[PDB]
Design an enzyme around this catalytic site. Structure first.
Site, mmCIF file in Angstrom:
data_model
loop_
_atom_site.group_PDB
_atom_site.id
_atom_site.type_symbol
_atom_site.label_atom_id
_atom_site.label_comp_id
_atom_site.label_asym_id
_atom_site.label_seq_id
_atom_site.Cartn_x
_atom_site.Cartn_y
_atom_site.Cartn_z
ATOM 1 N N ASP A 61 0.819 -1.221 0.000
ATOM 2 C CA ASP A 61 0.000 0.000 0.000
ATOM 3 C C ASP A 61 0.840 1.253 0.000
ATOM 4 O OD1 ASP A 61 -2.573 -0.993 0.037
ATOM 5 O OD2 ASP A 61 -2.974 -0.648 2.206
ATOM 6 N N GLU A 90 -13.831 -2.705 -1.751
ATOM 7 C CA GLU A 90 -14.053 -2.757 -0.281
ATOM 8 C C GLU A 90 -15.427 -2.230 0.070
ATOM 9 O OE1 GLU A 90 -11.279 -0.444 2.065
ATOM 10 O OE2 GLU A 90 -11.807 -1.555 3.874
#
Lengths: 241, 242, 243, 245, 242, 246, 243, 243
Positions: free
Chosen positions: F85, F164
């Protein structure tokens, strides 16, 4: 309390602005007691304090140091600081440099240059940094002056300019003009503190008058300056070309 | 050109040494022109230039900046710079501090403190750093301070805030020149803060200071009057003493 | 008042109790000085009360320096004392570098916590013109030994923390320098409290050695003036605040 | 009372006044939160009230980050707002770098002072997930009032989700609040804003500036003084006419 | 009264309660261990192997231990938090102190230094300056000298690694402070294992010193509880692990 | 070489209908165990701010922190693809995004993940042009915008995308419209694969299990068998089940 | 398995000669280990052979650390030794800081050049678990005295450079630890050469201590094998390499 | 006697093949120059061959600058080319800062890998006096576009990597500048290999594109001399090394 709006009001009232350079707390407090309107931490300190032949070696930290000293005297007059050469090459650099000086206690910054400075002036004023402009030499000089006023400069130093030419710039501008070597037709005057106190060997600059000679105290020399500026008898013809 | 040896020869010949603080090139040139013997870049700049209540904020770089300004006037007088507070707590630190000031133009450094400074002074002197000591108040201890720093190699000493008879005795006991401030007239020489003696302050004029500016025709005549008054014995007067 | 290190010793001689409080910013420091607090302490208690940490160990030197400069800008007439935090006085030369930084920022005296082992550090600092406040606590025989060693070395003030009243009485009687208690009962030359405790700004138990001086005062100023007067007339700390 | 940016918006819709106070350390922040302060602001006012400076211009990004970390360590339920100080948002990229640093330290929203010219900066931050609180100040024809509304609409439109109005005539502040859909928070802006802010130290009577009431008066504790402020904001009795611009 | 302190571990040795210690390097596991009533959580340089995948622990720096310490302390465990000074961070007492200070600022309540008899002056230096110390040692007669030496210097806890059960028993008998063993048998005041080893997060063959406590337990939390109960009832380590 | 999971092999898995099994991973011991269980992709995510650092949010996580954990995972030399990330604040311009990505790829990341919508298009295009593979990351008129976000980052060059907290039928439609693989967490079973936080699926959480997670430790003899169970349940389509779906 | 310090002491006692070459990168480190080179040295000779400098004085600690990490990544079984370069061990604590840096990079032992003035430094390092290789080279008497001093301070390997064969024999006989010769004749417990010298990658004229082992061999691997073998069978160095 | 960029262009025009080899230190750079290697490449291959990493991503600008200074200190007649590593040319300004650092360390030209997108970067560099070598590798249609776009922007040399012989032949024919092949077959203006590969330093199967020139030769010099000869007579690369 001399603020930026106060300077505008003084011009409209025809009250002449007395400005002097200032570099430390003791003189700053003496100047303020003599009712100096504007104290300038100018790159002139390169010659008068640092003893250099030119002002180019003066750094941003130097100006910030002397600015902090003057500010610590908490003068009622406006504290103005020069951005030294090389510290405003782009508008973002100018802003970073100005921020540093205003953190140290400056209330306005001075940037020297003509028309090209307009975008920089606007950038700074927009971000709440008050600007004093600084131009010198005639149609180009008038163009310069008008562009920096248009971009938002609220004060302007005219340096080394014929008196009639100075008078015309003053008549064209709405902001107050502050002369050195530019005649009595300005809204105010500036000298280098050390020059007007007679602290220089031999050759007095033609633009300058030694206010100390024949006065009983340093304080009376400064007060004399302030009074001569305001009653229009400095600068006299001898100090003007 | 005033050297450490000339200051010693001036004491032998009974010529009093005229010292003044100095923090920039313009006053440095003026002082030199009025034949000031010694110019001191002292931590009194914390008050007089920086406008602080005390001198503790004054850093080594401040002293080095003002020393470089003075030296650039190229005075014939001796340039002495103070080590500020905190910069001489071990002999090696003291040396690094002094070296920085001498690179900036100091010819001598001043370290304030008593007997305990002896090892520091010797360390510096050994390594070619001339030292001005600086001591104050009682009388027995001031005297062993004075002797210990002389013995350690100090070639000049400032006596600050000392009754006239005690300073007179210290000067007699030492063979190096003594430089009084608030120490009366029986010293080899005198020092004042420049801004004090030019009267660049209303209100609280300290007792040991005279205003030499008042009623002179120029700042140069003020300083010349200080130098003459120091040499002819009539500054400091009993007014400035105790 | 204008409180100097020599004035504290005079106060002890004259039987004037020294009122000390912690202080970390310019507003409270001006208010404390207006209430004639004698000594303001930039203490590592700020790790708890300002930084919200479980312990004072995360407090850095730069943190003390920052708060010290804030308090000093109020220009109090009282004496500004700063703590050297944990880890910053492990040798005498280190202690001196740390103290110098705090004094440049406005501290007039520094406080170092430790017993007898500190003796050489205290002497080093005092010789070099750093005034020192010692700080000891809890056993009793070693406490007096610690106190006597830091006094001999040159400390001009000492804090006694969490000590039975009779033990602190003894220490105060044996020492010639002023003692300042916190949780050490009333037989000390003076008292210190953490500001936020005495203003009642905790959740939970008041610590037992603290009185909440805000309670039913009309103002924060009046709470602080009550503290100073109570210290000076000897009715703080009271028996219920001692052990 | 876990106050999020959307909850403030709902407060404005419901007519529940938002109570905001400056806050600079963990001890006060816990007490403010126990008193149900909606929003805590780590403002550059700390330059005056904590550092003792004549102006707020010396406050640095590191000073704000430090006080923000103090406040956040109390874990308040109220919204943590941190000011970007002077000089730290001259370009959008610089603003974003400053904002990130404050949000790393615990800020949930950042406050930027300036008018219409900030519109791109606000857009830039908001698009990169930095919530922004704007901050502006200054008959139907009057130019100041008119420029103030243009400023307010501009930052709103660029995505500001809260706005402070400082030193504004009451009637002007009422029209700004009516024109905007986001909540307005006044200080020296009269009672017709969606909420109020004061400097903690001023409202505790530790100094009145004209915009300020001392809430310590007639209250038995510091906690009760903060409860009084929160209640007064919500019942419409602060600010009073005397507190107006 | 909820916190496990250095005095409390001393009480546990006197009262005969065995001390259950485990390595811990992050907040999630720190919390789970605390819920399982682990007595001491160690941020050890074993993280060099188990977390960083290095072949030795020498690459582990002071900053790595500090980072993982902060992660463990943010869980706010009741158990005592001990951190290793990594290799090369305790070569002089002054350095050792600087290193300890960094770890304690990050959340350690005690620091662990590995070494024998030569460490005594360093131990003394730290303890005097309020840094609690855990020693770490591992023929039998030098081991015994090393252990006495660090104990006299003021260590309040000692790890015994890879030592015959009989020799370890003597050490524990002759010292007064709690001994924590790993590969030293069951005659110690307590035990330690690497978290990942006792959870069976290893490829193939486990070390002789380790029992896989996870195998056939209903949850990671049950595995850690199993370990704590087996140390306390005296049946880890067994003869297999010695 | 052919043992290694590469981005093209993930695209082929989408085509072959083989579900992709991804887990967060933050150190060498778990990274070796995950690889031994045949996890396809290991993500060094900013979830480490909560699960490792114990912080309330992930905003404190620095690039240095992600770079440190990436190096840990990379030193296990897994066969699976290593994705890191970019943390909050590290991609505010495209040049800044490239400098951060470079740092992570120097540390062992094979692909970087940037969270945000449509506005990221220029940044994704800048990175992919410069040989940085990009994993996108989107979630929640609302469904309409999600689909625009998804198409824009794919158009720009992303070769993997995390969805998500998305309604299952919405996720289903995004997956059908995109041709890159989609990786769900809380987005139902109609994605090209799934991701969960390691510590969550090992049942190491303070008390309350989040909606999207199953505890795979329960009923299993070891942590290895828990991770093996995950990978199998993802591949046979029975994680996630209806109770795990938003 | 792994070549360890005790394994080297075993080799001396058993009469197996130790083959040591310099090494500065991963590829050569892998080849050396496949050829069963016992010890790989990241020496300041890299100043000459890699940096092209006239002397080795410019080689910094960062230089040695960089090549040490390159050699270490090959994961050789041979012992990885690294030189502390000139000026990085002027005091014992400096020596330890330098050694620690080299050990974090992959060094298993460090080599320090100097005589008996080093004894105190060697002791300090060995006490802190840094294994030390010594390096030395009337004079005969001082040489032996230097050797025994560094061995008694705790050195576990010693390089002997530019020494008459019979002096080197005597030194080796007097010591317990293994001696490693360069220009010291064949009566040492083993030999070191600079990699590039022994591979024949020098300009035309060969150093006197060196043989070009590459010349006439079918591969670089073969060249290195021939060196290892010649050292072990005692037919390098020869009398043309010695004095 | 120096090999210059325009000499390479003259070699293209005259049909003399350019022999290029990677090089990372002063000993080998001297040897390669004795062998009349035309171009020495400090390439990010050093991440594998020297640093022993799985990929070249970890190689820093500082690493490339160091090896560049090493090569340069041998003062080769041949042209010195340094690779800008991964991540050092993300914008034209950053590419220039990186290139300038490499040129100060001794590089005469820098190599930037990438296609058509680089055009603007190549122009920026070349305008500011940085000689640039491109590096690329229907399908064929894009290869040729990349190649023409970087040549047009000012690149003066181009490396063609893993390209089928026919395509590489067409690229070479359509460009004015010399092309340098690695696994791109024989119809290029010249060839590059990695030094360590062509010296056979790596065990078991070698890369298809590579010949071991050390096999059959009496010295390392003879290996490099053989490579240079085999490129210029057109008999490396052979069909077995191409596709």
């Amino acid at each position: 309390m001399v603020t930026v709006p106060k300077l505008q009001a003084m011009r409209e009232a025809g009250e002449k602005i007395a400005m002097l350079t200032s570099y430390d707390a003791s003189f700053a407090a003496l100047l303020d007691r003599a009712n100096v309107d504007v104290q300038l931490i100018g790159d002139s300190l390169g010659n008068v304090l640092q003893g250099q032949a030119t002002t180019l070696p003066v750094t941003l930290d130097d100006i910030a140091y002397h600015t902090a000293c003057v500010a610590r005297a908490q003068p009622r007059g406006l504290v103005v600081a020069d951005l030294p050469f090389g510290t405003y090459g782009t508008p973002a650099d100018a802003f970073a440099s100005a921020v540093k000086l205003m953190r140290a206690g400056a209330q306005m910054v001075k940037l020297e240059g003509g028309e090209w400075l307009a975008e920089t002036v606007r950038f700074l004023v927009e971000r709440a940094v008050p600007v004093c402009a600084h131009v010198g030499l005639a149609a180009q000089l008038l163009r310069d002056a008008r562009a920096v006023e248009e971009a938002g400069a609220q004060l302007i130093v005219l340096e080394a300019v014929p008196t009639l030419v100075a008078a015309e710039v003053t008549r064209e501008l709405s902001i107050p003009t502050i002369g050195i070597g530019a005649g009595a037709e300005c809204s105010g005057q500036v000298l280098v503190l050390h020059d007007m106190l007679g602290v220089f060997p031999g050759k007095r600059p033609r633009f300058v008058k030694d206010f100390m000679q024949g006065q009983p105290s340093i304080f009376a020399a400064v007060e004399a300056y302030v009074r001569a500026v305001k009653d229009g008898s400095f600068p006299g013809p001898e100090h003007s070309f």
